[PDB]
């Protein structure tokens, strides 16, 4: 009955029950609206994302994996689902609304207008990779780290959402042809993702923080290519051509001799580009994003650097306690399996 700002967009009826009242709207998910609600029950207001996935199968896909991992994630610095809001018949279920901490802005919206000091940058990079260090030890890559899927609230608290492109890390299968399509958001994607990666390492999730950080430093992305292989010239651009050992590493001979067909390009220096930056931030800044990704910094050595020494405390960066071992791939599943598998993920929070 309640409804919210009409228009197109899947977002007329926002029917989130008598618990969650005086909608305001946000803005547009992917799936539908998202608003912000009175928790009537916890006294405080929410985040509440309306969910009209069981048209597509890939919305359908990215739905399941979101839902599956955040109800098993339960870290500071990621995303929590507090509820979820369905039919209590899968003949009636049409849309899924999910229950959030209630975030006032993302990292894409804030350096839009907003400058960073470096302690904001020290302290959001800190958070970031702490959230990182547990997704990582639970097996899982995120595989679309950006500035829009880091939320934060009006007292910088930073935690880390969408798992909608998540899988489980499988680096004996990580290796593809040149030039093989993908899906995640084309300015945080490594260079090997172009060239023989199909974005199965933890090694891929790092190289997009390195982007962040570049893009904290400057209020501007360091790598905003136009077009699939456009996404690799402007890499390269900066990091310069590849030396023969790494270039030697990449086996392929389509991905090797595009390469060595380049005219020689030499490294743009860091201090140059971030004339204002602290060292010690571009020094872990070229750490991470380096060609190679078997010499890329790994997460936990990431925490470890000098210029995080402020916060580092190993015992304070909690890990999963198990890995997950559950399909996340979910491509041989028809919309009927899927669609059930939603309703079987979300019945925790059914009065039942
Ligand atoms: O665009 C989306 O998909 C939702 C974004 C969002 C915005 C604020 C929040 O507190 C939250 O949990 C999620």
């Not at 609230?153 to 489980?168: E, M, P, Q, S």
């Not at 040149?178 to 994607?189: D, P, S």
């Not at 791939?329 to 399996?337: A, Q, R, S, V």
């Amino acid at each position: 009955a309640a409804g919210a700002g009409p228009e197109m967009v899947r977002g007329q009826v926002f029917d989130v029950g008598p618990r969650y009242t005086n909608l305001s709207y946000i803005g547009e998910g992917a799936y539908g609206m998202v608003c912000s609600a009175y928790d009537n029950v916890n006294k405080v207001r929410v985040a509440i994302k309306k969910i009209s996935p069981f048209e597509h199968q890939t919305y359908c896909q990215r739905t399941l994996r979101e839902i599956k991992i955040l109800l098993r994630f339960r870290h500071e610095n990621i995303i929590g689902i507090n509820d979820i809001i369905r039919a209590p018949t899968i003949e009636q279920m049409k849309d899924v609304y999910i229950v959030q901490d209630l975030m006032e802005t993302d990292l894409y919206k804030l350096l839009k207008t907003q400058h960073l000091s470096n302690d904001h940058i020290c302290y959001f990079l800190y958070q970031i990779l702490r959230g990182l260090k547990y997704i990582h030890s639970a097996n899982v890559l995120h595989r679309d780290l950006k500035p829009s899927n880091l939320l934060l609230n009006t007292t910088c608290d930073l935690k880390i959402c969408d798992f909608g492109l998540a899988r489980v890390a499988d680096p004996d299968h990580d290796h593809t042809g040149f030039l093989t399509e993908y899906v995640a958001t084309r300015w945080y994607r490594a260079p090997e993702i172009m060239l023989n990666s199909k974005g199965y390492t933890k090694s891929i999730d790092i190289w997009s923080v390195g982007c962040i950080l570049a893009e904290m430093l400057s209020n501007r992305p360091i790598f905003p290519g136009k077009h699939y292989l456009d996404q690799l010239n402007h890499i390269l651009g900066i990091l310069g051509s590849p030396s023969q050992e790494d270039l030697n590493c990449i086996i392929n001979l389509k991905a090797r001799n595009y390469l060595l067909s380049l005219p020689h390009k030499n490294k743009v220096p860091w201090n140059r580009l971030f004339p204002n930056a602290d060292s010690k931030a571009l020094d872990l800044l070229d750490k991470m994003l380096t060609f190679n990704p078997h010499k890329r910094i790994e997460v936990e050595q990431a925490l470890a650097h000098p210029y995080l020494e402020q916060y580092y405390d190993p015992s304070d960066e909690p890990i999963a306690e198990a890995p997950f071992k559950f399909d996340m791939e979910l491509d041989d599943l028809p919309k009927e399996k899927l669609k059930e598998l939603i309703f079987e993920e979300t019945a925790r929070f059914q009065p039942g």
